[PDB]
């Protein structure tokens with residue numbers, strides 16, 4: 001029943017709030033490493049990970 005693909009998708013949103021997406025040039029309010037980000041808790045980052053997940057908002061995919 002554990003959806004690994006879904007859990008990691010949520011973890012990419014969670015990573016997006018906690019650590020960001022690495023790039024300096026990101027203008028996403030729902031994302032760290034962006035000027036528009038306010039420092040939230042990891043509990044709040046996981047809550048907002050689920051919010052952005054279910055609505056399928058602007059996710060920053062890791063593309064080297």
Ligand SMILES: [Zn+2]
Nearest residue numbers: 021026031060
């Ligand atoms: Zn970003």
